[PDB]
Design a protein around this motif. Structure first.
Motif, PDB file in Angstrom:
ATOM      1  N   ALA A 245      15.033   1.363  -9.011  1.00 19.36           N
ATOM      2  CA  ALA A 245      14.228   0.275  -9.649  1.00 19.36           C
ATOM      3  C   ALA A 245      13.240  -0.319  -8.638  1.00 19.36           C
ATOM      4  N   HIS A 246      13.582  -0.244  -7.347  1.00 23.86           N
ATOM      5  CA  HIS A 246      12.731  -0.766  -6.287  1.00 23.86           C
ATOM      6  C   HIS A 246      12.343   0.348  -5.317  1.00 23.86           C
ATOM      7  N   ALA A 247      11.229   1.034  -5.596  1.00 21.77           N
ATOM      8  CA  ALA A 247      10.793   2.164  -4.795  1.00 21.77           C
ATOM      9  C   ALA A 247      10.513   1.765  -3.347  1.00 21.77           C
ATOM     10  N   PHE A 248      10.177   0.483  -3.097  1.00 16.96           N
ATOM     11  CA  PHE A 248       9.946   0.091  -1.712  1.00 16.96           C
ATOM     12  C   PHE A 248      11.191  -0.556  -1.118  1.00 16.96           C
ATOM     13  N   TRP A 249      11.731  -1.586  -1.780  1.00 13.03           N
ATOM     14  CA  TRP A 249      12.839  -2.378  -1.236  1.00 13.03           C
ATOM     15  C   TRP A 249      14.129  -1.574  -1.028  1.00 13.03           C
ATOM     16  N   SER A 250      14.346  -0.552  -1.859  1.00 14.49           N
ATOM     17  CA  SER A 250      15.408   0.415  -1.628  1.00 14.49           C
ATOM     18  C   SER A 250      15.294   1.163  -0.294  1.00 14.49           C
TER      19      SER A 250
ATOM     20  N   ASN B 283       4.931 -15.317   5.940  1.00 13.62           N
ATOM     21  CA  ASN B 283       4.367 -16.214   4.938  1.00 13.62           C
ATOM     22  C   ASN B 283       2.985 -15.713   4.556  1.00 13.62           C
ATOM     23  N   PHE B 284       2.424 -16.223   3.444  1.00 14.56           N
ATOM     24  CA  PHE B 284       1.044 -16.002   3.042  1.00 14.56           C
ATOM     25  C   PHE B 284       0.747 -14.537   2.676  1.00 14.56           C
ATOM     26  N   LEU B 285       1.744 -13.799   2.135  1.00 14.14           N
ATOM     27  CA  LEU B 285       1.501 -12.479   1.565  1.00 14.14           C
ATOM     28  C   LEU B 285       0.623 -12.620   0.326  1.00 14.14           C
ATOM     29  N   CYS B 286      -0.504 -11.904   0.318  1.00 18.80           N
ATOM     30  CA  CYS B 286      -1.437 -12.059  -0.796  1.00 18.80           C
ATOM     31  C   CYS B 286      -2.241 -10.783  -0.946  1.00 18.80           C
ATOM     32  N   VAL B 287      -2.274 -10.265  -2.167  1.00 14.86           N
ATOM     33  CA  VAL B 287      -3.171  -9.154  -2.486  1.00 14.86           C
ATOM     34  C   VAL B 287      -4.170  -9.679  -3.499  1.00 14.86           C
ATOM     35  N   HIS B 288      -5.468  -9.388  -3.290  1.00  7.13           N
ATOM     36  CA  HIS B 288      -6.491  -9.801  -4.246  1.00  7.13           C
ATOM     37  C   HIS B 288      -6.156  -9.343  -5.674  1.00  7.13           C
TER      38      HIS B 288
ATOM     39  N   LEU C 153      -6.646  -5.820  -6.989  1.00  5.89           N
ATOM     40  CA  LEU C 153      -5.962  -4.729  -6.326  1.00  5.89           C
ATOM     41  C   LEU C 153      -4.462  -4.790  -6.620  1.00  5.89           C
ATOM     42  N   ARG C 154      -4.081  -5.594  -7.619  1.00  7.17           N
ATOM     43  CA  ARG C 154      -2.661  -5.760  -7.907  1.00  7.17           C
ATOM     44  C   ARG C 154      -2.075  -4.478  -8.484  1.00  7.17           C
ATOM     45  N   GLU C 155      -0.788  -4.248  -8.207  1.00  7.45           N
ATOM     46  CA  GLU C 155       0.039  -3.173  -8.760  1.00  7.45           C
ATOM     47  C   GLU C 155      -0.474  -1.801  -8.330  1.00  7.45           C
ATOM     48  N   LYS C 156      -0.998  -1.739  -7.101  1.00  8.24           N
ATOM     49  CA  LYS C 156      -1.458  -0.508  -6.481  1.00  8.24           C
ATOM     50  C   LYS C 156      -0.612  -0.180  -5.246  1.00  8.24           C
ATOM     51  N   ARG C 157       0.559  -0.840  -5.100  1.00  7.82           N
ATOM     52  CA  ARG C 157       1.467  -0.603  -3.986  1.00  7.82           C
ATOM     53  C   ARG C 157       0.833  -0.970  -2.643  1.00  7.82           C
ATOM     54  N   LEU C 158      -0.107  -1.921  -2.626  1.00  8.34           N
ATOM     55  CA  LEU C 158      -0.683  -2.407  -1.386  1.00  8.34           C
ATOM     56  C   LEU C 158       0.285  -3.341  -0.643  1.00  8.34           C
ATOM     57  N   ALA C 159       1.041  -4.161  -1.372  1.00 11.07           N
ATOM     58  CA  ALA C 159       1.966  -5.091  -0.720  1.00 11.07           C
ATOM     59  C   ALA C 159       2.941  -4.318   0.184  1.00 11.07           C
ATOM     60  N   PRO C 160       3.582  -3.196  -0.209  1.00  9.48           N
ATOM     61  CA  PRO C 160       4.461  -2.477   0.727  1.00  9.48           C
ATOM     62  C   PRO C 160       3.760  -2.037   2.009  1.00  9.48           C
ATOM     63  N   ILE C 161       2.502  -1.637   1.904  1.00 11.39           N
ATOM     64  CA  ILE C 161       1.759  -1.146   3.056  1.00 11.39           C
ATOM     65  C   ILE C 161       1.608  -2.306   4.047  1.00 11.39           C
TER      66      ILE C 161
ATOM     67  N   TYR D 258      11.993 -15.068   5.390  1.00 12.94           N
ATOM     68  CA  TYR D 258      10.906 -15.313   4.446  1.00 12.94           C
ATOM     69  C   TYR D 258      11.484 -15.971   3.211  1.00 12.94           C
ATOM     70  N   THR D 259      10.581 -16.626   2.461  1.00 11.66           N
ATOM     71  CA  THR D 259      10.992 -17.204   1.195  1.00 11.66           C
ATOM     72  C   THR D 259      10.038 -16.701   0.116  1.00 11.66           C
ATOM     73  N   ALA D 260      10.503 -16.775  -1.128  1.00 10.22           N
ATOM     74  CA  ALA D 260       9.676 -16.491  -2.309  1.00 10.22           C
ATOM     75  C   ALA D 260      10.293 -17.178  -3.509  1.00 10.22           C
TER      76      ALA D 260
HETATM   77  C1  LIG Z   1      11.135  -7.476  11.640  1.00 10.69           C
HETATM   78  C2  LIG Z   1       9.819  -7.825  10.985  1.00 10.69           C
HETATM   79  C3  LIG Z   1       9.958  -7.746   9.432  1.00 10.69           C
HETATM   80  C4  LIG Z   1       8.675  -8.383   8.808  1.00 10.69           C
HETATM   81  C5  LIG Z   1       8.632  -8.154   7.295  1.00 10.69           C
HETATM   82  C6  LIG Z   1       9.740  -8.856   6.576  1.00 10.69           C
HETATM   83  C7  LIG Z   1       9.613  -8.666   5.058  1.00 10.69           C
HETATM   84  C8  LIG Z   1       8.434  -9.514   4.462  1.00 10.69           C
HETATM   85  C9  LIG Z   1       8.439  -9.469   2.943  1.00 10.69           C
HETATM   86  C10 LIG Z   1       7.278 -10.278   2.351  1.00 10.69           C
HETATM   87  C11 LIG Z   1       7.654 -11.762   2.192  1.00 10.69           C
HETATM   88  C12 LIG Z   1       6.494 -12.531   1.496  1.00 10.69           C
HETATM   89  C13 LIG Z   1       6.745 -14.033   1.418  1.00 10.69           C
HETATM   90  C14 LIG Z   1       5.597 -14.708   0.672  1.00 10.69           C
HETATM   91  O1  LIG Z   1       4.479 -14.815   1.195  1.00 10.69           O
HETATM   92  S1  LIG Z   1       5.998 -15.221  -0.924  1.00 10.69           S
HETATM   93  C15 LIG Z   1       4.397 -15.407  -1.728  1.00 10.69           C
HETATM   94  C16 LIG Z   1       3.944 -14.094  -2.321  1.00 10.69           C
HETATM   95  N1  LIG Z   1       2.519 -14.208  -2.732  1.00 10.69           N
HETATM   96  C17 LIG Z   1       2.151 -14.404  -3.995  1.00 10.69           C
HETATM   97  O2  LIG Z   1       2.943 -14.535  -4.917  1.00 10.69           O
HETATM   98  C18 LIG Z   1       0.650 -14.482  -4.195  1.00 10.69           C
HETATM   99  C19 LIG Z   1       0.226 -13.844  -5.550  1.00 10.69           C
HETATM  100  N2  LIG Z   1       0.662 -12.488  -5.692  1.00 10.69           N
HETATM  101  C20 LIG Z   1       0.220 -11.481  -4.964  1.00 10.69           C
HETATM  102  O3  LIG Z   1      -0.628 -11.638  -4.108  1.00 10.69           O
HETATM  103  C21 LIG Z   1       0.779 -10.111  -5.216  1.00 10.69           C
HETATM  104  O4  LIG Z   1       1.387 -10.115  -6.530  1.00 10.69           O
HETATM  105  C22 LIG Z   1       1.885  -9.669  -4.201  1.00 10.69           C
HETATM  106  C23 LIG Z   1       1.300  -9.452  -2.815  1.00 10.69           C
HETATM  107  C24 LIG Z   1       2.995 -10.754  -4.092  1.00 10.69           C
HETATM  108  C25 LIG Z   1       2.517  -8.370  -4.671  1.00 10.69           C
HETATM  109  O5  LIG Z   1       1.488  -7.397  -4.802  1.00 10.69           O
HETATM  110  P1  LIG Z   1       1.371  -6.591  -6.178  1.00 10.69           P
HETATM  111  O6  LIG Z   1       1.851  -7.444  -7.276  1.00 10.69           O
HETATM  112  O7  LIG Z   1       0.009  -6.097  -6.151  1.00 10.69           O
HETATM  113  O8  LIG Z   1       2.432  -5.413  -6.092  1.00 10.69           O
HETATM  114  P2  LIG Z   1       2.396  -4.023  -5.247  1.00 10.69           P
HETATM  115  O9  LIG Z   1       2.161  -2.912  -6.272  1.00 10.69           O
HETATM  116  O10 LIG Z   1       1.422  -4.093  -4.172  1.00 10.69           O
HETATM  117  O11 LIG Z   1       3.865  -3.919  -4.632  1.00 10.69           O
HETATM  118  C26 LIG Z   1       5.003  -3.986  -5.458  1.00 10.69           C
HETATM  119  C27 LIG Z   1       6.216  -4.157  -4.553  1.00 10.69           C
HETATM  120  O12 LIG Z   1       6.072  -5.482  -3.934  1.00 10.69           O
HETATM  121  C28 LIG Z   1       7.317  -6.153  -4.090  1.00 10.69           C
HETATM  122  N3  LIG Z   1       7.031  -7.597  -4.127  1.00 10.69           N
HETATM  123  C29 LIG Z   1       6.409  -8.291  -5.105  1.00 10.69           C
HETATM  124  N4  LIG Z   1       6.275  -9.564  -4.756  1.00 10.69           N
HETATM  125  C30 LIG Z   1       6.850  -9.681  -3.535  1.00 10.69           C
HETATM  126  C31 LIG Z   1       7.038 -10.761  -2.661  1.00 10.69           C
HETATM  127  N5  LIG Z   1       6.643 -12.006  -2.922  1.00 10.69           N
HETATM  128  N6  LIG Z   1       7.644 -10.536  -1.496  1.00 10.69           N
HETATM  129  C32 LIG Z   1       8.033  -9.277  -1.169  1.00 10.69           C
HETATM  130  N7  LIG Z   1       7.904  -8.204  -1.952  1.00 10.69           N
HETATM  131  C33 LIG Z   1       7.298  -8.434  -3.142  1.00 10.69           C
HETATM  132  C34 LIG Z   1       7.798  -5.671  -5.434  1.00 10.69           C
HETATM  133  O13 LIG Z   1       9.157  -5.961  -5.681  1.00 10.69           O
HETATM  134  C35 LIG Z   1       7.489  -4.186  -5.311  1.00 10.69           C
HETATM  135  O14 LIG Z   1       8.438  -3.466  -4.511  1.00 10.69           O
HETATM  136  P3  LIG Z   1       9.528  -2.535  -5.264  1.00 10.69           P
HETATM  137  O15 LIG Z   1      10.224  -3.481  -6.123  1.00 10.69           O
HETATM  138  O16 LIG Z   1       8.722  -1.516  -6.059  1.00 10.69           O
HETATM  139  O17 LIG Z   1      10.484  -1.974  -4.240  1.00 10.69           O
END
Ligand SMILES: CCCCCCCCCCCCCC(=O)SCCNC(=O)CCNC(=O)[C@H](O)C(C)(C)COP(=O)(O)OP(=O)(O)OC[C@H]1O[C@@H](n2cnc3c(N)ncnc32)[C@H](O)[C@@H]1OP(=O)(O)O
Ligand SMILES: CN(C)Cc1[nH]nc2ccc(-c3ccc(F)cc3OCCc3cccnc3)cc12
Ligand SMILES: [Mg+2]
Length: 411
Positions: free
Chosen positions: A1-6, A157-162, A165-173, A192-194
């Motif tokens: 169900a989670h191609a990246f988080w898995s 913090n501050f994860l954001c995709v324009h 470009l949503r739902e193109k798997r940019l967030a995993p990259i 992190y929090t969400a």
């Molecule tokens: C040791 C160092 C480690 C450092 C890294 C630690 C981890 C950091 C983790 C980040 C902590 C961030 C903390 C904050 O800043 S939380 C605030 C998040 N930002 C927003 O909500 C702003 C508005 N939304 C967007 O900009 C986009 O919808 C985002 C970027 C959120 C997703 O872009 P998009 O909608 O275009 O999707 P995709 O096709 O690219 O990617 C889909 C995959 O992304 C997974 N997804 C969705 N939302 C989140 C989320 N909030 N945290 C983590 N993963 C998330 C999702 O389950 C799926 O994976 P999988 O389910 O298929 O497996």
């Protein structure tokens, strides 16, 4: 169900979570030398970019991406509008690492398309109290205590995709590249929090709001006039009466925090936060940065009695864009930050917070039920909101804790 988080080192289920008895890493250990030295491959039409937080244009680019594309409420009525001065504050604490701010730009025109930021934090993240007790009973005290020491990790913090470009798997990259840059500095955990549910939180708390300007909150449909207020001939006047506050703080002794207070605030804050299972450790420099007043960004007051700071509170400002109201463009929100009470009940300290915020033209005060925030919800007329802030670690097994065991505020 989670191609990246898995594919990642996080607990995959609540069940796995429930079988965790000790803090520690998920992954078997890796080394710096093992990590690829080159950025992650990306499409030839995009490029990686490390913004310069000393450059106004760079901060502006980040600001505009987030203003137009960052977190909205569930009903798409409000979108956070962090200011440029707030972003400089949040992104550049003492000893921040420029390389941990990761962006993707479109090569042709340098349009910012995606951003993620990491900053350093020192976190207590060892086995929680309730689990240490269980361990003592199992003769498993040593393993339980192994990771007790504060750790130097990354706060994401501050994860954001324009939006385009949503739902193109940019967030995993973005997440993979951030992980790489952090791992290259010999840091292997992040916090992190969400608002959204991902695999898998170690704590979850409801958020809360306290109306300071109910007429405006009703106008922009942040609030309604609650149906109970219909029994009244005049619903609104009653609503203002309900949420009215004094003009001035009731604690004599309250004043704004100044630089000379830093050592005392550090002491009382660090002593208080020890009561909590997960929480930051702040140096004097970090106390200065996160708590000294900054216009439009962070507001901090101390109670000083007989030339000794005994209590303090802080709040920070995040305006939201109101999507489509003919009368108001912005919601001016105050968010409860760190605090410590030693001389007075917490409800009495935080009432002063609400008084100051109201005086300074805030519309609402918000908070998550972390720290001891539950103790003043009823008397201070906070109401539970429609969702939760979830707390997560990357590469850290951690037993479930109550949010009232969490002392990390995330901006
Ligand atoms: C040791 C160092 C480690 C450092 C890294 C630690 C981890 C950091 C983790 C980040 C902590 C961030 C903390 C904050 O800043 S939380 C605030 C998040 N930002 C927003 O909500 C702003 C508005 N939304 C967007 O900009 C986009 O919808 C985002 C970027 C959120 C997703 O872009 P998009 O909608 O275009 O999707 P995709 O096709 O690219 O990617 C889909 C995959 O992304 C997974 N997804 C969705 N939302 C989140 C989320 N909030 N945290 C983590 N993963 C998330 C999702 O389950 C799926 O994976 P999988 O389910 O298929 O497996
Ligand atoms: C903490 N960082 C990562 C920002 C962040 N990312 N996802 C988030 C979801 C909720 C909150 C949040 C936190 C404390 C609080 F007292 C109220 C809150 O939300 C009220 C609802 C809302 C959401 C979005 C816009 N307007 C209202 C922050 C979030
Ligand atoms: Mg995408």
């Amino acid at each position: 169900a989670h191609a990246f988080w898995s594919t990642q080192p996080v607990p995959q289920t609540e069940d796995e979570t429930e079988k965790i008895v000790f803090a520690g890493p998920m992954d078997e250990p890796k080394t710096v030398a093992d990590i690829p030295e080159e950025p992650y491959p990306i499409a030839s039409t995009f490029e990686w970019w490390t913004p310069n937080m000393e450059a106004a244009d760079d901060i502006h680019a980040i600001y505009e991406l987030l203003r137009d594309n960052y977190v909205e409420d569930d009903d798409s009525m409000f979108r956070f509008n962090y200011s440029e001065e707030f972003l400089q504050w949040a992104l550049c604490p003492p000893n921040y690492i420029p390389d941990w701010h990761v962006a993707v730009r479109r090569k042709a025109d340098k349009k910012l398309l995606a951003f993620i930021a990491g900053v350093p934090v020192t976190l207590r993240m060892g086995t929680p109290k309730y689990m240490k007790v269980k361990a003592q009973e199992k003769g498993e005290g040593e393993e339980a205590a192994k990771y007790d020491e504060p750790r130097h990790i990354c706060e994401i913090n501050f994860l954001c995709v324009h939006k385009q470009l949503r739902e193109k798997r940019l967030a995993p990259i973005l997440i993979k590249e951030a992980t790489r840059r952090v791992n290259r500095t010999n840091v292997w955990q992040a916090v992190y929090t969400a608002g959204v549910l991902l695999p898998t939180p170690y704590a979850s708390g409801q958020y809360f709001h306290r109306s300071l300007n109910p007429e405006k909150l009703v106008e922009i449909r942040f609030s309604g006039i609650p149906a109970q207020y219909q029994k009244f001939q005049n619903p609104m006047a009653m609503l203002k009466r309900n949420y009215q506050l004094p003009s001035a703080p009731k604690n004599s002794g309250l004043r704004e925090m100044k630089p000379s207070d830093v050592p005392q605030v550090r002491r009382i804050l660090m002593n208080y936060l020890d009561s909590f299972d997960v929480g930051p450790v702040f140096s004097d420099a970090e106390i200065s940065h996160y708590l000294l007043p900054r216009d439009g960004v962070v507001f901090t007051y101390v109670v000083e009695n007989d030339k000794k700071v005994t209590d303090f509170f802080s709040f920070y400002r995040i305006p939201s864009t109101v999507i489509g109201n003919s009368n108001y463009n912005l919601l001016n929100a105050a968010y409860v930050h760190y605090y410590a009470a030693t001389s007075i009940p917490l409800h009495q300290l935080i009432l002063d917070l609400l008084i100051v915020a109201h005086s300074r033209g805030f519309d609402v005060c918000n908070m998550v039920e972390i720290l001891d925030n539950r103790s003043f919800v009823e008397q201070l007329k906070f109401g539970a909101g429609d969702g939760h802030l979830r707390y997560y670690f990357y590469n850290w097994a951690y037993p479930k804790i109550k949010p009232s065991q969490v002392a990390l505020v995330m901006l």
